[PDB]
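User: These chains co-purify. Model them together.
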Amino acid sequence: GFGGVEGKDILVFTRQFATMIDAGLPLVQCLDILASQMDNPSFKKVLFAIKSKVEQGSTFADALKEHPKVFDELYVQLCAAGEVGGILDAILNRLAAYREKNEKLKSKVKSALVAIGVTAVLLLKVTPVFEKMFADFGSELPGPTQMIVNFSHMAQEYFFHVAGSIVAVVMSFTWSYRQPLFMPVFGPVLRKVAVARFTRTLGTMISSGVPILDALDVTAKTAGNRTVEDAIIYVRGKIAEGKNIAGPLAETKVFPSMVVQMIGVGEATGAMDTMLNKIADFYDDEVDAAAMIEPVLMVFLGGVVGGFLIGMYL
Amino acid sequence: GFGGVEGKDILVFTRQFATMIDAGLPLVQCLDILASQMDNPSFKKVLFAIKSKVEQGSTFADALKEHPKVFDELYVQLCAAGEVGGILDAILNRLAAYREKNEKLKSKVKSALVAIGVTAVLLLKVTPVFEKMFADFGSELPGPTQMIVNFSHMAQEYFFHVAGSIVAVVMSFTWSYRQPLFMPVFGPVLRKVAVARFTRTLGTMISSGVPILDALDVTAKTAGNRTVEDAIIYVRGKIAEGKNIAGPLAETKVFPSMVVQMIGVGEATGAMDTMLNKIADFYDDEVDAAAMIEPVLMVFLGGVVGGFLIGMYL
Amino acid sequence: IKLVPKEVAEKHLVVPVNRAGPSLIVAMCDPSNIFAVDDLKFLTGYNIETVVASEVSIREAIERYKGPSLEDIVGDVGDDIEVTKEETENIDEMAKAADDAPVVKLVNLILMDAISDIHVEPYEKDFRVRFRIDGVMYEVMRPPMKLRNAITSRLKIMASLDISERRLPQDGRIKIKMGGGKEMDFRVSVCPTLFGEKVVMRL
Amino acid sequence: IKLVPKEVAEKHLVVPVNRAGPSLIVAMCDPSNIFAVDDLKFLTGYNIETVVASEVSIREAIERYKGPSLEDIVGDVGDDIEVTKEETENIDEMAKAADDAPVVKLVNLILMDAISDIHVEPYEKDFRVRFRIDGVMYEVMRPPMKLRNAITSRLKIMASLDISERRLPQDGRIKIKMGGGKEMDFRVSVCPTLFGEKVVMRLLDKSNLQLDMTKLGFDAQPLAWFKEAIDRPYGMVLVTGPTGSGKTTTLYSALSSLNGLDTNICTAEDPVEFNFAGINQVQMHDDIGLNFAAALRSFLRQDPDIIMIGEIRDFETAEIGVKAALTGHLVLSTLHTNDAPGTVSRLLNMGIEPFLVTASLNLILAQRLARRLCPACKKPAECRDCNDRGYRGRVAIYEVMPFWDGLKELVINGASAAELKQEAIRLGMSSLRMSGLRKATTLEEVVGNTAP
Amino acid sequence: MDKYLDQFVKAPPAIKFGGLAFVVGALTAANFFMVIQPTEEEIGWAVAERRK
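Assistant: Joint model of the five components:
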């Protein structure tokens, strides 16, 4: 018996492979880099073993088959479908987006059938069960009827409470579904997520040995947010013209003073790889902290429960 | 009407004065340095004005009196008590520790009625509500009584469950209050805080113009953690013998590969001041952000809930 | 400091004043008196280092043992250089009336501690000077580590700077109120000067 | 450690003391006893490496017993050099009472691990040395890679530096508490030294050589009188020489030999090496983050009659130095070089001109090591700097004394009395002459008698 | 091994004698207890018989 790896940790590693492979590095060199940039041993250890099979000439799909407890049949088949069709790059991008959506969805049920499914049944009916069970403590409560009425009339009068229960359900479903003119002012710009991804990708390609300009040309093709893609094309154009990396960044609001000042050190130090790796880890942890997706649950959780109980009493 | 300054910003500045004054720099030169190293204008601006009074010959206590909205009566009196008794150095160290405890205590109530208050009620009773909900689903559960007993006996037998609920509460309160044989292995070593303080102190004395070795001799007397003091005495001893600063650091785990690589660039560039200032501000921001403070919550969260449910079951 | 009975110090007009390099520093008014010296050698059991001092200065030190000073120090309105010397002095006199209720005019020491070449090389080393006619000569002025350190901060501060282990060397200038200047080099601790703290003054 | 029965060790006075490179190290008092050796070979089944030891030391070790050490190591209050050796030792004794409850006085090894040439070339290579009489000889001391590495860090650290794969070579100096010095070259790993880590130590041993070293034939008494003179009227001098020809020793000799009791002298060194029996003296040492220039720059500032710079190696200080010479101080220092283009090249390459150095530098001694098989000879190979030339080749140098190695003699080579005249006058010049022909080994006493 | 053996020729007359003595002390403790218990039993049988 062996377990997989965390949702976070699959995420980081699938993202960073998709990024390196779409950069045109050799698959074995992609594998080496993410292993060598890893913080947990179990990841660095596996990825050396996956790479060891790839250097014997096996496909990535067949190399991941050595860890079926970590990469399930659906993951390998996605890889292998990409390898068979000549689309390994775009299926890894798909898998990275998949792993990101999976981790975010995990944090965000749990915060405040897997665990998400069992916890989501369990939260969706907790209250409405409470409710039915206070309303089953005997007869002649607030709002009931006597049991001798005809059933249809008894059930229709309680319709109030059947309704307050369904509304309670709809609410906890909404919290679980949501929760996992200046025209340019209205466009979605770069977020925290998109800066964290950028920084990880660049930290990744620099630590591997790619120059800054080669890493930026790859990244400018793999950036999801259009306004950031436009930002990064401008940063790369500025750097390729001979402007200093920290100065192309300083023109764009999305990079704080600390980010620019830290990058500006990294330029003079030949340590940009790592400046970016520490920036990226800082951002990835700020991202996963960012907490209102769990407090607003609980607001609607007990607020609806209490609204039911109040409802019939009155 | 004028406001004070932030808890963070009093902190940084009281620390860095205590550090410079305990170094034996002249008080006016201490004042100049922290003003000249400041990032906010309002701080650099005041500290030029406090220094302007000190160069007219006034005490630091009487110079801070020009900003009574920033340095309260209790702060000045501590300074003035230090100045009257010949202990200005040790009362500034006390004030720096005070300001650090004040900022940390501020972040840490406020963090998460705001959102923290609403989320903390909401987490503290979630479980104990679930619990009362499953135990209100009728009669003749695990451990109950029949309703016809006398109330006092019924309530006393359940005392088990009333107790398992309170314990659940105490636990989630502990996680919210805390959280905001190899004998040497058991000693508290250097933390993030202690590295951030060290780096700020050194960034501070180097930017002011002190050499590395003069700054290390002061710092080795003002380091609070004993194991770090022992580390820093070894770093200073190595440097004074003619070993290169990055090489004395590289022997000690508390300095990452990059802190060392960055310091190693600073040695060859004559920019150790700039390097240390940016290292320190990176660390100070990592400190105030700060991942095990959230995983251990959840351990006690569901672990206590489950302990209750099992408790009456049996 | 320690002697045999206070009475013996006063009778023989001698006073121990430190212990350094296994020897007891003894300030003595009559160093030709082998009876007194041998009495001190036998009673203390310590090897002596004799320092000649003026009789009344020894007596004064015996009786002080710098109190009247230990209190006048806690008077911020004295050290303040912003105040003209003419008035500052007055405070020190009137404040001194506390003990006996007179004005003492001109306390030499109380003033000496509030208001062409001097070489001060290390701890317990006699100062050397360059005299206008005599040139390099040794002097009867020595300071042990504590006194050295105190001088050193004194001179440093009056020259307007802050010498410390962080900034151990200091090249400033003293402005005597008489518009007269002097070049002061100075070192704290032993980090650059193994022989201890030290100062030089080219008047 | 392991033997057969404790009784057998005591009876035969032998003790195993380690196992290395499949062999059992056996300390043995009677290595001629083939019966005992063959008994140990048969009973252990192990191949032996025999080490002779004094009988009572073996017995003591048997009864006392790398373990007692494995615990005394975790005692920070021991390694600390800030603590006087006299007290530190005490802790080690009392702490050792833990095992058997006595005080052992003088644990040789426990001390040996806490408190003229040594060549340590590689892994598992026997150390070589230069003996005062025997010269190059092999030694019974070898260290495998682990022990080498450990020595290497030990010596590195005691010299005050941090050798590592990032900084694999290290050219420092050990300060023996007896004030004595030694030059240490050292290499970690194999990146520069394929044969493994390695170290070399050219031992000084000091308490500083005096002018009593016309015993050692290094400088003739006549020349030493000429320098005695020279140093009294403040002629500035640099001691040049290849590595370990005697530069620092000779310098320290010349300052030490003079009566410096009436002049303020004033020294700036990267580490202590200079001992002087003189009262008016300020000793200055480079600290963290200070350049040599900081200390000289601020020091010349006071009033030194004499300035001694250990050795010029940042020439930003060199510049301050020759500036000090042109105000008219008496400056002295050391420089690594073997002849005149060596130095001048070396001096000019951080921006002092030969007008400033050569014009204000008075005398330059050149030191050597001469070897004739096993004699170790340090001699002053040779130099009076007259000045500069307008339109030139510059450095005008009049060689006073050369050293002929074929006869081991110092010859005067065209120097005349009219050269060294450079005196403010007749009475001054006369004083120089008297010291020339008119002008007890310990430094304290020698200084004591030049003083007079 | 012989140093221990001459520690055995010097001392353990004393140590063997001592061991014998501690043993005989224990056995006398035991037999005194084994004469105190029949006393109690005997008083008991007295109390039964008189009740008959």
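Residues 9 and 44 of chain E are 54 Å apart (CA to CA).
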